[PDB]
Write a new protein. Structure first.
Lengths: 142, 256, 254, 247, 133
RNA sequence: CCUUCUCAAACAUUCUGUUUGGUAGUGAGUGAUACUGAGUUAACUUGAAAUUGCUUAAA
């Protein structure tokens, strides 16, 4: 979990003050090119469900504490049916810190920088070894 | 020194061997040069010696690679503080005429982040065939580039000059790059009795210039390196005995 | 609380923005309420001066900040500069616990103590928070009084400091005042030469207040002695004499 | 509990520091032997870094210079090598937030090279020297009726005479003059004076002081430079500004 | 069943015998810590073996460190069965070359060089090349 | 859970040349062809792969 959050905190999205600065530069260049392609985590629930169903998501993080739980109880099954790597983590508050909110139901990486593709792949393999093979038997039992 | 008669008969013999009734690999000409006391000593040296040669084999390399799938390209590693001043467009303007093409302009920060993984770094480093690096950064490269890059004499970088006096200069950079490409040839100096010079391929270039190249290489190396034995060789080929000295072996026991 | 939230969430940029976009309290309205009369402010200026001079001499600890000490030193230097410029030092009394000065500030006799420049061992067994609170109030009152006196006397407040002279010798001589009897007329055209061991700050303040100019041997160590009229020097047995100079001791000036 | 990542990071950092000190030791051995056959470069560089940041690279004149050296904690996960540890102990700068005055000669340049990651080097102004002596000056003093001595402040001037009277040093201002002018008996007075214990730039762990510590670390990363090349210029900064902050 | 010996693989740089022993001591007493190393230039081969007094301590260490992510390496730890302990993997330094005595004098080595030239002379024709001298 | 030897000297001034010096690398493995069991010599596969040749960065 510490490794996953250390990865995601490099892709924490734009804050309002930073958006004002970037719109300032675009206005200078307005009168594609003005700003570079952004990289950030995706965090809305409907947005991430859409990304999963389009298989655009490379890794999904799901808060374990969602009330009502019916909002995320289908996400692991959806991610399995779609082949998207997923991980259940402790804290909607911790997920929300990643996206400048108080809480966040989910977070996701779809695109990563070149210097982080390898770290993302190793994180996925680590979660597979520690979380998929470890909990596969027990998550199906009452 | 070495008369041209020996060289031309050697070339005829080599073509006879290479016409035997893959191909490019076995067609490469290696000039084994054997030294009495090695070439550097007890301390290693990854510095690539550049030798002034009339005929540049890199343009034949470009042509043969265009005909083949080898995909000749030139890498230009520079300083982190001058990669911003260097522009691909200025490079194309200043090097299009003289037949020089620099593919990608990479940085130490790129070797530290973008390719800080053995697979990606090896792919990137093995794709290129000629490397030119600022002599400021060549000292720091062996940690950034790794050992797999410096292992083969093709991939190890070449120290080039890019600054004029105390500051970077585009004219200095382009002049040094052109001079390196069309005026010099790379070798290494092992901690061993022998080395070889990669003249190129028999398919690429003509014997009329191979003779000049081998003669100049032999004389340039023997002038300073106290060379005793020099062998022309091809891949899967016998050693072609060319030069033989009976002088330097006396100091072997003096050192002993 | 909000800065704690920003730091605990990891948004250092928003933490910096919050810190920048804040303002501390002021005490000027309190100064006006407490002392409606400038004579009353001058009346109570004495303990303010005493505490400011006490704090300027302390080293920085885990409690007292270098910022606080430097502000106090600046206020003390400005007060001394004004007093020396307008020549209103009337009495000086050197004791073991430093030096007492008595000045005629707008018809009020103002007396204060300046400790000698030595590394006092701070006890820390007394409450520093209360002393810092009093120091804050006294600094506010002294800023008010200094601005008033500077403007009335015709100077500009705050005076611009000279960085080269601050580098040479930190203290009274750095602050330079630009405009727009018999004590004040004493020592007209007298060049004193202060050797190393004489307390340069004490001597220079007293001389500038009572007329006359100073040449410090300590102040030349960074890198003349021809127009010097007096020389002050403390030694058991001094070296050879100029025989064209005059020799005195600090108690002579006092 | 001790974590594997902490162990490994310490090992790697310490090995790199050992390598840097080794290459510096070899380079200075060759330079002292005065052989330029196989050398990166054969002279001593000083980098003045002042205020972004403007840098000046200059060649050491060789004339002795009064330097002020303030100990700061080095990079994390680096356990100090024995050579640097011995040099710092000889300079009695073992713990952080201390400072000493040092003579700068060609015999002292390589020592600064070896101890560079743990110290901040500057040339103090006379105001800084005077403030240090007049605010934080402590000595070890022994009494006639006291079996064991104890450290005192520099309050009394008669102690200066009674201890260092044969060198002509009579008072604290004499000590200050000897240091500032870099004259004789400077070493004796420096030995007499204890290392100056400075105060931490930021202390406390409230939200405000944590933000101050973050800003301070940012500025330190801006100013201090860690290089592992043997041809490393000795880095000197605004020690006067640092001392106005720490004193 | 299971023994008290552990095989560790996918080690990063800077995880040597001493570092492995220091880290795994806080799990329990150790009897042998050994690491694979390269001969020519002393470098770790990123695997090693450890021996525990208590086989349960060994199993606990394996469960703790089985799939630990450690600075980009997904460590692997396996408890070995009975027997098959550590037998090799001596800590090798960086070897430095050492000169060997040339008993053959100048005359003998020059005669050897002559004979090597003679071997080239009688080998080229059988190889299938024709060239002067 | 650190983060990598980012240029020096002289000679010449020709908006620049010459010389010289500075570079000890993840591991494992395939492989040819020779040079003197130690030092050398073309290409090749790979997830960062792998079973035994100082203390205010504290609490």
């Amino acid at each position: 979990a510490a490794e996953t959050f250390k990865l995601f905190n490099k892709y924490r999205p734009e804050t309002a003050a930073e958006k004002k600065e970037r719109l300032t530069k675009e206005a200078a260049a307005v009168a594609q090119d003005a700003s570079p392609k952004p990289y950030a985590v995706k965090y809305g629930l409907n947005h991430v469900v859409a990304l999963i169903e389009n298989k655009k998501a490379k890794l999904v993080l799901i808060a374990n504490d969602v009330d009502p739980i019916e909002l995320v109880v289908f996400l692991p099954a959806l991610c399995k049916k779609m082949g998207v790597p997923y991980a259940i983590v402790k804290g909607k508050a911790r997920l929300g810190t990643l996206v400048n909110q108080k809480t966040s139901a989910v977070a996701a990486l779809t695109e990563v920088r070149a210097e982080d593709e390898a770290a993302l792949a190793k994180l996925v393999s680590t979660i597979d070894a520690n979380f998929a093979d470890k909990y596969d038997e027990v998550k199906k039992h009452w | 020194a070495i008369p041209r008669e020996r060289v031309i008969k050697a070339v005829n013999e080599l073509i006879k061997f290479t016409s035997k009734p893959e191909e490019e690999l076995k067609k490469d000409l290696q000039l084994i040069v054997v030294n009495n006391k090695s070439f550097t000593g007890t301390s290693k040296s990854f510095k690539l010696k550049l030798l002034n040669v009339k005929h540049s084999f890199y343009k034949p390399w470009k042509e043969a690679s265009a005909t083949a799938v080898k995909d000749f390209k030139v890498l230009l590693i520079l300083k982190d503080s001058d990669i911003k001043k260097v522009s691909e467009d200025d490079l194309f303007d200043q090097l299009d005429s003289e037949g020089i093409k620099v593919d990608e302009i990479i940085c130490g920060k790129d070797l530290k982040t973008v390719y800080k993984a053995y697979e990606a770094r090896n792919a990137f480093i093995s794709q290129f065939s000629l490397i030119l690096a600022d002599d400021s950064i060549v000292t720091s490269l062996p940690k950034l580039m790794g050992g797999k890059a410096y292992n083969k004499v093709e991939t190890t970088p070449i120290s080039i000059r890019t600054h004029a006096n105390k500051e970077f200069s585009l004219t200095t950079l382009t002049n040094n790059i052109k001079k390196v490409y069309m005026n010099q040839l790379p070798v290494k100096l092992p901690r061993g009795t022998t080395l070889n010079v990669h003249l190129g391929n028999l398919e690429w270039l003509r014997p009329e210039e191979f003779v000049d190249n081998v003669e100049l290489i032999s004389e340039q190396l023997i002038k300073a390196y106290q060379i005793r034995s020099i062998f022309i060789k091809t891949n899967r080929s016998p050693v072609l005995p060319l030069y033989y000295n009976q002088d330097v072996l006396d100091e072997l026991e003096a050192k002993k | 609380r909000k800065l704690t939230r920003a730091l605990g969430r990891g948004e250092v940029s928003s933490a910096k923005r919050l810190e920048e976009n804040r303002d501390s309290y002021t005490l000027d309205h309190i100064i006006k309420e407490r002392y409606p009369s400038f004579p009353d402010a001058i009346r109570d200026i004495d303990d303010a001066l005493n505490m400011l001079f006490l704090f300027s001499n302390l080293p920085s600890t885990n409690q007292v900040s270098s910022k606080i000490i430097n502000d106090a030193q600046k206020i003390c230097n400005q007060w001394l500069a004004y007093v020396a410029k307008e020549r209103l030092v009337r009495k000086v009394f050197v004791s073991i616990k430093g030096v007492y000065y008595q000045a005629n500030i707008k018809g009020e006799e103002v007396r204060w103590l300046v400790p000698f420049k030595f590394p006092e061992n701070i006890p820390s067994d007394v409450d520093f928070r209360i002393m810092l609170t009093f120091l804050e109030f006294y600094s506010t009152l002294l800023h008010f009084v200094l601005y008033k006196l500077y403007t009335d006397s015709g100077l500009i407040y705050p005076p611009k400091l000279d960085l080269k002279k601050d580098k040479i010798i930190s203290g009274l001589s750095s602050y330079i005042l630009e405009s727009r009897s018999p004590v004040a007329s004493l020592f007209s055209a007298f060049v004193f030469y202060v050797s190393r061991e004489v307390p340069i700050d004490i001597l220079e303040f007293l001389i500038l207040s009572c007329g006359g100019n100073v040449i410090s041997e300590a102040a030349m160590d960074q890198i003349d002695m021809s127009k010097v009229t007096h020389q002050i020097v403390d030694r058991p047995v001094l070296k050879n004499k100029v025989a064209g100079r005059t020799y005195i001791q600090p108690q002579w000036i006092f | 509990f001790v974590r594997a990542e902490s162990i490994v990071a310490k090992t790697l950092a310490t090995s790199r520091e050992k390598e840097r000190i080794k290459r510096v030791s070899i380079l200075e051995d060759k330079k002292a032997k005065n052989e330029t056959q196989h050398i990166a470069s054969g002279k001593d560089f000083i980098l003045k870094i002042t205020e972004g940041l403007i840098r000046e690279k200059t060649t050491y004149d060789g004339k002795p210079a009064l330097l002020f050296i303030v100990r700061v904690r080095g990079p994390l996960a680096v356990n100090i090598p024995n050579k640097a540890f011995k040099i710092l102990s000889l300079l009695r700068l073992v713990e952080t937030n201390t400072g000493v005055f040092v003579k700068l000669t060609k015999n002292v340049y390589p020592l600064l090279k070896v101890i560079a990651p743990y110290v901040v080097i500057g040339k103090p102004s006379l105001s800084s020297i005077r403030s240090l002596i007049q605010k934080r000056g402590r000595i070890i003093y022994k009494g006639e009726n006291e079996a064991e001595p104890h450290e005192i402040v520099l309050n009394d001037n008669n102690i200066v005479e009674e201890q260092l009277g044969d060198h002509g040093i009579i008072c604290v201002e004499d000590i200050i003059h000897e240091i500032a002018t870099m004259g004789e008996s400077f070493s004796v007075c420096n030995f007499f004076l204890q290392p100056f214990k400075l105060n931490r730039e930021v202390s406390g762990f409230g939200s405000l002081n944590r933000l101050r510590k973050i800003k301070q670390r940012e500025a330190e990363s801006r100013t201090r430079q860690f290089s592992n090349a043997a041809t490393a210029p000795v880095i000197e900064v605004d020690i006067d500004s640092l001392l106005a902050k720490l004193n | 069943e299971y023994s008290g010996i552990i095989y560790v693989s996918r080690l990063p740089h800077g995880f040597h015998e001493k570092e492995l022993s220091k880290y795994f001591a806080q799990f329990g007493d150790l009897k042998e810590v050994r690491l694979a190393r390269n001969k020519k230039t002393g470098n770790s081969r990123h695997y090693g073996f450890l021996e525990f007094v208590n086989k349960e301590d060994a199993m606990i260490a394996q469960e703790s460190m089985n799939n630990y992510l450690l600075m980009g390496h997904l460590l692997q730890v396996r408890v070995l069965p009975k027997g098959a302990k550590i037998e090799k993997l001596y800590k090798y330094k960086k070897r430095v070359l050492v000169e060997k005595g040339i008993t053959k004098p100048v005359k003998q080595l020059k005669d050897n060089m002559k004979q090597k030239h003679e071997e080239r002379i009688k080998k080229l024709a059988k190889s299938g090349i024709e060239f002067k001298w």
